[PDB]
Structure formats: C-alpha cells, structure tokens
C-alpha cells in the first residue's frame, strides 16, 4: 500500500498523497511517516506530500545489516545515509528542487540534506531541532545525551544481570566470568549486543519453553543430568534435582561450576570420557 | 578455521576437531562454541567434537530476518529453530545418532532436540538447565525472569526518558504523547524496541553530527525555523533561537508542541500553506 524506492542497502517505504509540488516530511524519533498523514490531508490539495519511513523503521527494510560501527556514538553513517535517502527520493519524484520539512532528529536529517544535496532543496523547514554541535554549550548537552544512554543501556543492563545472578544464586566465580568485559572495544560492543539479544530473545522464551517431565521419561535411558561441583546451591542444580526426583534419571557431578567446561576442562572431560567415551 | 552448514534462514558455523563418534556441544548465553575448545582439546582422541555457534551468535549469520514475533516472551520460534539446527548438523556429520551436551540455555536447546528429533540422539547430557516450565513453582521463576527483563528493556528506559525530558524541559503535552503506551502488547513491544534503537543508534550520533552555522548561512534564503506554540521553554526551541540570533534566519511559530503536526494538523497546515503554498 506504501510506495517503495529501492536504494543501496534498503527498500525505503513512503506514503504519497496529493497533487502539486513535492513536499517531503522527515520524521523524528518515531521513525515513520504515518505521524504526518493527518497533516498530509490538510495539504494534499497543494502539494504531493511524501511522508517517509526512514530506512531503519516502520515498513522500510534494510537489505544488509547495519555496519558494526553504527553503534559508536560518533558514527556518521546513519545520519548521512538518511540524508542521501531523502535526496535520492526527491530526485526520483521530481525534476525540480522540492519542499522538505523535518522534525526533531528528522530536522537533523534535513540539515544534512541541505548540506550535502542542496540542489534538491527549494525551501526547507527545521521543526524544533535538538542538534547541539554548533551551540556555545554543546558539551553540556552532548554529555547529557551520552550519560542518559549510558544509564539506560549499560547501567541498566549491568544492574539487571547482577539481579539475575542473585535470583539464580550463581556462584561468584561464575558471576565474574559471565559478566567480565571483553578485552577490546569491538569485543565489548559485541558483548553488549549479544547480552541484549539474549535478554530480549532468549532468556524468557527458552526458560518457559514447552518441555514436560514426560519428555524425559520417554527417553530416560539416553539422558545424564550434570551438576557442577563448584555451583552447589544454584537454581539450575535444583532443576536437575527435580528432574531426578520425578524421573529417576541420574545426576553425575562434574568439576567446575556453571562454566566448568572452561574452568576445569581436564576434569570435565574425564567425567565425559568415563560416562560415554 | 570454522566449518559451515547452510540451513534455512542462516549459515551455521561450528568448530570441528578430533575423531571417532560425533559429540556436539551447544552453548548457553554466550552463544558461541569457542567456549568449549579447551574441553575439545581433552576429548579429541575419543570423539569428533563439534562446537556450535548458534545461528544468532558469533560467526554464524542469519540470511533472513527474525520473525517480528520473536520478541514476544512466549515465542518459541528461536528454541525450535536452534534445536532443528542441531538435528540437521547431526545428520550432516553422522549416519549414527550422536552424543550431545548442552549447558544452561544450550541444555534447553538439547532438550528440544530430544523432544523433536530423538532419532539423532545417541546419548544426551543437560548441564545445569535453567528451564522452569515443569517445576511445581514455575510461576515464581517465570515471573521473576519476566520482571527482570522488563526492568531492563522497558522500565530503565522509562525512567531515563523522564529525566531526559526534564533536562530538555520537554512540554507535558509532548512527554505524555511520546510516552503514551500502545493499546496492544505487541504494539508496546515495538514501541520499546524503536525507542531502544533510537537511543543506541540515533540520539547521540545525530545530535552531535557535523552541522555548522556556516552550513545554514550559505542558504539562509531557503530555511525556515519552526517553533511550536505549546512547547515553549524546551531545549529544541533554544536551538532555533540560537540559529536565528547568529544568522537572522526567521523563526515562524506554529500550533502545537514538539509533535504539533499530529497534535494540531489543521493549524500546522495553515502555517505551512502561508509559508510555501
Ligand atoms: Mg549497490
Ligand atoms: Mg511495563
Ligand atoms: Mg562527528
Ligand atoms: Mg531553555
Ligand atoms: Mg493563510
Ligand atoms: Mg513563502
């Protein structure tokens, strides 16, 4: 139902109503053009209104993953790519310069359209821009932005991962290993990504997944439960004790803690070789 | 040097060392099989050890996006797909059923391998599983996991944004609107994901991007700055006041606040028509 312009790295989706000169609306934080549609109706008798879903939002779709560096707070990839999207969009819709309005971060995209593709711009409006780079007090506002993101993404994550470990009674040596930062900045950003992904897409879905005790009894001859010798008292050992209680499936104790296969790989292997090998 | 198995929706990468019967190791929250390589070193004379990067982690890569519903906490797409990955890997490497060990969430994957693809399992070991579904106190453990994830992915965001709105003196009209929850659970999930994306990938990058007052003055004839009439005292209006003081570029007042285009679309359109119609 939405129009599409295929660009390098994305299919850009946009609403288009009206007749007349082109007027491109660039959204802020919500990312999507639908917030402009009530406005577009008031205007459709005077402009061909184009309301964009920026490529990372809404119905637009990336055709390749974001570059890993986009996570850096001084990355310029996305803002420049958004501006180039609007310029390519204007060129595809019009042989003349067009009207552009951006709001909030969308007004920042519009600033970059004017800077890098002024030939597509007839008139432009910046609705309540939050850019701080050229301000006398730029550093104050930049630091506030940096600190709020740090608070939410990193502080919120470290405090909740500590809460997980205490909720499950994880042994210190396990807690430490599992929350240990990566020795490189690229490793640390990956480690953040991978943890957020686990929190959002794995922990809840897997720990309440569809497994019953009957699934264990049907194949009890195949199964060994393993409890670490250095992780006693933790919730995962209680899960195994329950399985054992209800099914008779054996528990074999194995060196190390929750991470004993890396903590004590010699001792872990010996148990497995005796079990199976 | 990693091996590859091309499956539906992903290229599954794994380490393969040793010789004899296949023994697949399924990692937990770290997602990657390198954590088993010291253990593999100790096992490689008795087993062909296979240590998997689950498809969402490490050197594995998706070739199709995840389903939108994977974010839902009762989704079971990912655990079932992980389990299917292990099963196809076993059939690719061995004509005999194989040995399997998983730890932590990897042990839950192993559980679904036994449930759905028992034919590929010779023997299987569940090292310290944190699954709670079949426990007599499942509700306690399930609701604790749900609370902690919610805290991080949504509430730490909600609290940080309120302090951020006070720092920028965002008008109550706009704060209420920007933080109004969606009328659907899945709609609220998408809201939070969108805001978390903006937080990580947009606010810092865009607000400290490379725009100077010189970029404006080159084209002062094209530009209108817009301030809402219901968002007085907010930081984005201070940015427009600075640009106007330094360059003379006009500010035009327009109905509504920071989201004035959806708050008062008729009055917003009236001003834009005065400007460009
Ligand atoms: Mg190309
Ligand atoms: Mg909530
Ligand atoms: Mg920069
Ligand atoms: Mg002020
Ligand atoms: Mg008029
Ligand atoms: Mg005019």
UniProtKB/Swiss-Prot annotation, chains A, B:
Main EC class of this protein? hydrolase
Recorded hits in SUPFAM superfamilies, A to Z, give: alpha/beta-Hydrolases
Instruction: Mention one GO molecular function.
Output: hydrolase activity
Q: What is the protein name for this chain?
A: Uncharacterized hydrolase SAUSA300_2518
Cite the source lineage: Bacteria, Bacillati, Bacillota, Bacilli, Bacillales
Q: Which organism is it from?
A: Staphylococcus aureus (strain USA300)
EC numbers = 3.-.-.-
Q: Carries keyword Cytoplasm? A: no
Q: Is this entry keyworded Lipid metabolism?
A: no
- Which residue numbers delimit the AB hydrolase-1 domain? 21-138
């Amino acid at each position: 139902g939405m129009e599409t312009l295929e660009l390098q790295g994305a299919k850009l989706r946009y609403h288009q109503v009206g007749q007349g000169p082109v007027l491109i609306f660039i959204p802020g934080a919500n990312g999507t053009g639908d917030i402009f549609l009530p406005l577009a109706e008031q205007l459709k008798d005077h402009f061909t209104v184009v309301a964009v879903d920026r490529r990372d939002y809404g119905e637009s779709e990336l055709t390749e993953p974001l570059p890993d560096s986009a996570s850096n707070p001084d990355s310029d990839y996305r803002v420049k790519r958004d501006a180039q999207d609007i310029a390519e969009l204007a060129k595809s819709l019009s042989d003349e310069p067009v009207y552009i309005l951006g709001s909030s971060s969308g007004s920042i995209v519009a600033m970059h359209v004017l800077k890098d593709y002024p030939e597509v711009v007839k008139k432009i409006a910046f609705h309540e821009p939050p850019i701080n780079t050229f301000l006398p007090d730029s550093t104050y506002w930049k630091d506030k932005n940096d600190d709020i993101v740090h608070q939410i993404l990193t502080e919120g994550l470290e405090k909740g991962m500590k809460t997980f470990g205490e909720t499950l009674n994880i042994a210190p040596i396990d807690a430490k290993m599992m929350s240990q930062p990566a020795d490189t900045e690229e490793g640390r950003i990956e480690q953040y990504k991978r943890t957020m992904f686990w929190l959002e897409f794995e922990i809840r879905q897997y720990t309440h997944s569809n497994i019953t005790l009957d699934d264990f009894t049907k194949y009890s001859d195949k199964i060994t439960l393993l409890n670490g010798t250095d992780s006693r008292g933790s919730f995962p050992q209680d899960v195994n004790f329950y399985i054992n209680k209800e099914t008779g499936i054996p528990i074999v104790d194995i060196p190390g803690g929750h991470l004993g296969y890396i903590q004590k790989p010699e001792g872990f292997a010996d148990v497995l070789l005796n079990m199976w090998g």
